[PDB]
Each structure stands twice: as structure tokens, then as C-alpha cells.
């Protein structure tokens, strides 16, 4: 009667920490014969320890081997604690154990091979521990075993062939382990299996055909393994199957057409299974299928119209395949269809008007296809439309002017089509637009003032159209992050309100007609990493305020009329990789502060009025690699000696100056691939190391009479 209680005390000696109640109620009192009122304990009719339940206490220690002394133990619940150490093989001695839950601990080493002795054991939870080693075959010989959860351990080796011995096993979870080898054919003999989680392991070989012997199967996950061979699955069994996920394996063959047999299937997911061949017609037999994801395979052929018979279809993900043909009009028929993801395929023809008429579709992701046709006015009638990415297709015609009225557009990316006409004023009517991508079309006209109103726009890409006119003013509390307008006809001054968008990261205004001065307000943009104003009619000077943009990687103002001296305050853009001033009126001599930017790998200041000489400071620039272009500055002097320090410099254009000097210093550029010295007054011979390119590009030395030969 005291025996179990004494057993509990030895076990207690193995514990690092216990709740205060354990400290206070577990102890020998000459007036107490039994542990039955002790904190974690529940006793028998006969007053022996029936249950020991420590769950979700903070208990640290080991489970001592004395646990085997409790021959009346029914429930042992240690779940969710700090336990560590090995699981004792003497547990195989608790002859009455029904439930054994060791989950969510730090248990380590091997799973005991003695659990076989437990004739009454129903549920076994080992999940979320540090367990390791092989799985004992005896583990599937536990006679009454119903549920077994091994997930999240370091377990390794094969799924034991004895798995076929477990005729009571209902739910078996092995995921997130090191299990390797072939799935044993004997798995089909485990006849009760409902839920089978084999995913996230190291398994190889084929899905065994005997998986078709399990007629009580609901849930099968074999994904994230290394499996090959055909997927031989589907049969008159699998009428109970709700969920199938085979994703991330390398199969040889296609989607098995036999899946037509599994009438209850809710979700069919094989993403990246190296599947080739055709999408089977038989998939149209599935009335309950809410998810079909075949994406990232080698799938060919057309989409069967029969899929328009999957009445419950919610997600159809076909993306990243070789699929061809027209999108079946039958799909518009599905009134539960939320997301149609066709992108990155070979689809052609128009999107059938049925699909454009869907009041269920939120997301139409068709980009990177050969699709074409005109955008119908019906599109403006899809009330649930949120994301539409039609980019990289043959779509033509105007964008319907009402797009955005029956509101709630979030993302419009139409880039890279043949679209003509103006930009619709209503795209932001619902005040949800994050992404307006119209770039690379035939569009024209100005930017509607209403679009300027949309503060939710994060990414605005109009680049490469026939757009023209002035820019909108932008607001404080505008979300603009990425702006690219390059290659248009935009004119007028750069709006100063652009500096108010605190989250602005990237600005490309290049190849436009912008005039006037660069607004000093742009000094407010401290998240700006990239700025391209190049190729405009910009004039005046660079505001020193731009020194406040501390995040700048890339700054290109080239090809404008800018003048003045380069502000020395710019010594603080400590992230600058790229500086391009070429083709302007800049003066005040070549900037000295350049070495302060340790990150500068590209310096092209060509064709300005800088004057003076090449500074010796130019010689300590740590990272100069891609180009150094000083050409066309009326630079006078000789090549300063420090310049020979640039041993990472790949290209040098010094040409078209008044430099009168040796050319000797160039022996020191050890990485130089290309050089251009022309129309200079350099006296004396050519250095040795410029030969190979001197052989191929002799032109680069012209305008220097006094250059000699070796």
C-alpha cells in the first residue's frame, strides 16, 4: 500500500524541479499509508497508483527506471515539461499502462524495445523530443496500439517491416524525422490506418502499391521526402480519403488518373513532384475537392473542361508548368472558385467571358503566358476581384475605364502587354490599391489626378510607355515605396511633394523630359537606396540636402544640364556603390571626398566642366572596380602617382583631356582590362602591361603622337 508511494519518492529524487505542491505533498507521514492525495496522483479502487499526471507543470529531471515498480499504472502523463535523459526500458514493465504521453520534453537517446510488453497500451505520444536511433520493430507489435505520434524527433533508419503487424493503428504520425529507406510494402497490412503522416523525412523509392489496401484512409502525407517512381495510387479503396499531399519528391510519371475513385477528396496537392504528362479528366469526378494544386511540375496538355465539374473548387493552382491551350470556359461555372493561378505556363487564346463574369474570383494570376484578347467590360463587374496579374501576355485594347469602381482592387499588374489607350482614373476608387503596374505597354496620355490621391500605392510602375504630361503631387502619409517611370514623355518639374513619402526606397524618373531643379525636399527620403534621374532636361545644382539620404546605394543624374560644385556633404552617403555624374555642366574640380565612401565601386564623372587635375585622393578608393571615367573634363596635369593604388579597377577612361604627362603610373593597375587614353598630351612611351587590349583596341591611344612602341 506504501510501496507505490515509496516508488514515487525514489522517482522524486531524479527530479531537478517540481511544482510547490509536489514539494509539500510528496513525503512520508507516519499517519499516511498511501500517496493517493499527493499532488499529481490518482489511485485505484484498491488504492494503488493508477495515474501520474505532471502535464504543463515546469518539471525538470529524468524519468527514473523505478517507474516500472508501479504495476497498477494506467495513465502516465509527463507531457510538456523540461524532462531530459533517456526513456527507461523498465516502462515496459508497467503492465497496466493504457496512455503513455512523454511528448514535448527533452527526452533523448533510443526508444525502448520493451514497450511490446504493454498489452493494454492504447495511445503513445513521443512527439517533440530529442529522440534518436532506429525504431524498434517491437513498437508496432504493441497489441492494442491505436494512436502513435513520433513527430519532431531525430529518429532514423527504416520504417520497420513490423508495421504490418499493427492492426489497431488508426493514426500514425512520423513527420519531421530522419527516417530513410523504402516505405515497406507491409504498410498495406496495417488495416485500420486513417491518418498517415510520413512527410518531412528522408524516404526514397516508390510509394508502395499496397497503400491501396488501406480502405479506411482519410489523410495521406508523403511530401518532402526523396521519392521516385510512378505514383501508383487510387483504387476502389480511398473512398474515405480527404487529403492527399505528395509535394516535393521526384516522381517519374504523372498525376494518376485512378484518383477518380476517391470521391471524398477535399484537397489534392502535389507541388514540385516532377510530374509530367496530362491533367486527368477523372479529376472532374471530384465534387468535394476544394483544393487542386499541381503547380511546379512538367505538366503538359490542356486543362480538361471536366475540371469545370469540380463544384466545390476553391483554389486551382496550376502554375509553373508546360500547360498549353485555352483556359476552359467551363471554369467560370465554379461558383466557389476564389483563386485561379495559371501563371508561368504556355496558355493561349482569350480568357473566356465566363471567367471574367465570376463573382467568386478574388485572384486571377495568369502572368507569363501567351494569353491575348481584349479586357472585357465585364471585368469591371467582378465584385470580389482583388489581385489581377496579367503581365507578360498578348493582351490588347484599352483597359476598361470603369475598372476599380465595383471596388477593392489591391494589385493590378498588367506590365508587358500590347495595351493601348489611357490609364483608367478609377483603379483606386475602393482605396485598396497597393500595386499599380502598367509598364511596357502602348499606353499614352497623362496620369489621372485621382491616382495621385491613392495613398495605398506601394509600387507604381509606369515605365516604358507613351505617357506624358505633369506628375501628380503626392502626399504625406503616402505609402509609395517603389517608383519607376523611366522611358516616357513626362515633363515639368519633379514634384517636391515626392520627398514627403517617408518609405520611398527607389526612384527611377530616367529617360524623360523633366525640367527645372532637383527638389531639396528629396533630402527627407532616408530610406531611398536608389535614385535615377538620368537623361532629362534637369538644370541647376545638386542640393547639399541630399546628404540626408543615408541609405543611398545608387545615384545617377547623368545626361542633364546640372551645374555647380559637387557638395562635400555627400561624404556621408556611406552606402554608395555607384556614382554617375556623366554629361553635365558640373564644375569646381573633381570632388575630393570620394575616398570617404568606402563602398564606391563605380565612378563615372565623364564629360563635365570639372577642370583642375586628377586628385591624389582619387587613389585611395578601396572598392573601385567596374569603371573610373574622368574623360572629357579639361583635366590638366599628369597622372598622379596614387592612382596606381587601384588594383581592383577593371576599366579606365581618362580620354579627351589636357593631361600632359608620362603614362608611366599605369603600370600599377593590376586588374585593368580596358583603358581609354585619347586626345591627351601624354608624353613618352606606352607602358608594357597595356598590350593585349592595346593589340585589339589600338584606337584607345590616339591623339597622342609621342606614344612609342616596344
Amino acid at each position: 500500500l506504501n510501496s507505490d508511494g515509496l516508488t514515487l519518492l525514489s522517482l522524486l529524487k531524479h527530479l531537478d524541479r517540481v511544482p510547490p505542491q509536489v514539494t509539500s505533498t510528496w513525503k512520508i507521514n507516519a499517519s499516511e499509508a498511501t500517496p493517493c492525495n499527493w499532488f499529481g496522483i490518482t489511485c485505484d479502487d484498491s488504492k494503488n497508483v493508477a495515474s501520474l499526471n505532471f502535464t504543463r507543470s515546469r518539471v525538470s529531471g529524468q524519468l527514473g527506471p523505478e517507474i516500472g515498480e508501479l504495476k497498477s499504472l494506467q495513465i502516465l502523463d509527463l507531457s510538456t515539461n523540461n524532462f531530459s535523459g533517456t526513456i527507461p526500458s523498465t516502462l515496459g514493465n508497467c503492465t497496466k499502462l493504457a496512455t503513455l504521453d512523454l511528448s514535448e520534453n527533452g527526452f533523448s537517446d533510443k526508444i525502448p524495445d520493451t514497450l511490446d510488453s504493454l498489452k493494454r497500451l492504447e495511445v503513445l505520444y513521443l512527439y517533440i523530443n530529442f529522440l534518436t536511433g532506429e525504431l524498434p520493430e517491437s513498437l508496432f507489435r504493441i497489441p492494442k496500439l491505436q494512436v502513435l505520434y513520433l513527430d519532431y524527433n531525430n529518429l532514423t533508419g527504416p520504417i520497420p517491416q513490423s508495421i504490418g503487424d499493427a492492426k489497431e493503428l488508426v493514426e500514425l504520425s512520423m513527420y519531421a524525422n530522419q527516417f530513410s529507406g523504402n516505405i515497406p510494402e507491409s504498410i498495406g497490412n496495417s488495416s485500420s490506418l486513417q491518418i498517415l503522416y510520413l512527410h518531412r523525412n528522408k524516404l526514397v523509392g516508390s510509394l508502395p502499391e499496397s497503400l491501396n489496401l488501406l480502405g479506411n484512409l482519410t489523410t495521406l502525407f508523403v511530401g518532402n521526402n526523396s521519392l521516385q517512381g510512378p505514383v501508383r495510387f487510387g483504387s476502389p479503396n480511398c473512398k474515405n480519403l480527404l487529403t492527399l499531399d505528395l509535394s516535393y519528391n521526384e516522381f517519374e510519371g504523372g498525376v494518376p488518373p485512378a484518383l477518380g475513385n476517391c470521391s471524398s477528396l477535399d484537397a489534392l496537392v502535389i507541388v514540385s513532384g516532377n510530374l509530367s504528362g496530362t491533367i486527368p479528366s477523372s479529376l472532374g469526378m471530384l465534387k468535394n475537392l476544394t483544393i487542386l494544386n499541381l503547380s511546379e511540375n512538367r505538366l503538359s496538355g490542356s486543362i480538361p473542361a471536366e475540371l469545370g465539374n469540380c463544384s466545390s473548387l476553391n483554389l486551382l493552382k496550376l502554375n509553373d508548368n508546360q500547360l498549353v491551350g485555352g483556359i476552359p470556359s467551363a471554369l467560370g461555372k465554379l461558383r466557389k472558385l476564389e483563386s485561379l493561378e495559371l501563371f508561368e505556363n504556355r496558355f493561349s487564346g482569350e480568357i473566356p467571358i465566363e471567367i471574367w463574369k465570376s463573382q467568386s474570383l478574388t485572384q486571377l494570376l495568369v502572368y507569363q503566358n501567351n494569353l491575348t484578347g481584349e479586357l472585357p467590360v465585364e471585368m469591371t463587374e467582378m465584385k470580389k476581384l482583388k489581385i489581377a496579374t496579367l503581365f507578360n501576355n498578348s493582351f490588347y485594347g484599352a483597359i476598361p475605364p470603369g475598372l476599380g469602381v465595383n471596388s477593392s482592387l489591391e494589385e493590378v499588374d498588367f506590365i508587358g502587354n500590347k495595351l493601348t489607350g489611357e490609364i483608367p482614373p478609377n483603379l483606386c476608387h475602393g482605396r485598396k490599391l497597393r500595386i499599380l503596374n502598367l509598364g511596357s505597354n502602348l499606353l499614352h496620355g497623362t496620369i489621372p489626378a485621382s491616382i495621385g490621391h491613392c495613398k495605398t500605392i506601394r509600387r507604381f510602375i509606369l515605365r516604358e510607355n507613351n505617357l506624358s504630361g505633369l506628375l501628380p503631387e503626392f502626399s504625406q502619409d503616402h505609402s509609395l515605396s517603389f517608383l519607376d517611370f523611366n522611358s516616357n514623355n513626362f515633363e515639368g518639374p519633379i514634384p517636391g511633394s515626392l520627398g514627403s513619402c517617408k518609405n520611398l526606397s527607389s526612384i527611377n524618373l530616367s529617360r524623360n523630359r523633366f525640367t527645372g531643379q532637383i527638389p531639396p525636399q528629396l533630402g527627407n527620403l532616408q530610406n531611398l537606396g536608389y535614385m535615377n534621374l538620368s537623361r532629362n532636361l534637369l538644370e541647376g545644382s545638386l542640393p547639399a540636402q541630399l546628404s540626408n539620404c543615408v541609405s543611398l546605394e545608387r545615384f545617377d543624374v547623368g545626361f542633364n544640364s546640372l551645374n555647380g560644385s559637387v557638395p562635400s556633404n555627400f561624404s556621408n552617403w556611406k552606402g554608395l556603390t555607384t556614382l554617375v555624374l556623366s554629361e553635365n555642366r558640373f564644375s569646381g574640380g573633381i570632388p575630393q571626398f570620394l575616398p570617404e565612401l568606402k563602398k564606391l565601386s563605380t565612378l563615372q564623372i565623364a564629360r563635365n566642366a570639372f577642370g583642375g587635375e586628377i586628385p591624389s585622393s582619387i587613389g585611395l578608393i578601396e572598392d573601385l572596380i567596374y569603371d573610373l571615367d574622368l574623360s572629357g573634363n579639361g583635366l590638366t596635369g599628369e597622372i598622379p602617382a596614387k592612382l596606381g593604388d587601384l588594383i581592383k579597377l577593371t576599366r579606365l577612361n581618362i580620354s579627351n583631356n589636357n593631361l600632359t604627362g608620362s603614362l608611366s603610373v599605369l603600370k600599377g593597375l593590376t586588374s585593368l582590362l580596358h583603358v581609354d587614353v585619347s586626345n591627351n598630351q601624354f608624353t613618352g612611351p606606352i607602358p608594357d602591361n597595356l598590350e593585349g587590349q592595346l593589340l585589339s583596341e589600338p584606337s584607345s591611344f590616339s591623339g597622342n603622337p609621342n606614344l612609342c612602341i616596344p
Binding site: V269, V271, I291, N293, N319, Q363, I387, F391, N437, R459
Partner: peptide
């Protein structure tokens, strides 16, 4: 038996420019 159902693979979300 005990816990919540394991979720099926999402695949890759659609991108934009």
C-alpha cells in the same frame, strides 16, 4: 487522440513586378 490538423503545401505565392 488530441491535436490540430497538419496543413497541406501552399506552393509559391504569385509574384508581381
Amino acid at each position: 487522440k488530441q491535436r490540430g490538423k497538419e496543413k497541406v503545401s501552399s506552393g509559391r505565392p504569385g509574384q508581381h513586378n
